[PDB]
Amino acid sequence: SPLGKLQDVVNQNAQALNTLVKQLSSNFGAISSVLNDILSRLDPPEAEV
């Protein structure tokens, strides 16, 4: 428990990286998170949007 401060620093950094990686599964209003799916199922102007 005494080393909890050092473990909080490691945990915060790990959580931040995990959140950043998890954000790649977010559509953000797009049809799909996957870029390849968007390119395959849409024409290039619609895909670019």
């Binding site: 024409d43 290039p44 102007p45 619609e46 670019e48």
Partner: protein
């Protein structure tokens, strides 16, 4: 650029439009800047037979 096409295919003369005319006859780039002008030519371009 001047050509004669069917009335249905007028929509295909646009950036990022997929059609028989667009794929194999006249292709417009997506980043194209300019004006597409189309008018009916039935009276002069159509003959009987």
């Amino acid at each position: 650029d001047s050509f004669v096409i069917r009335g249905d295919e007028v929509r295909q003369i646009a950036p990022g439009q997929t059609g028989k005319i667009a794929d194999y006859n006249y292709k417009l780039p997506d980043d194209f800047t300019g004006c597409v002008i189309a008018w009916n030519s039935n009276n002069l371009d159509s003959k009987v037979g």
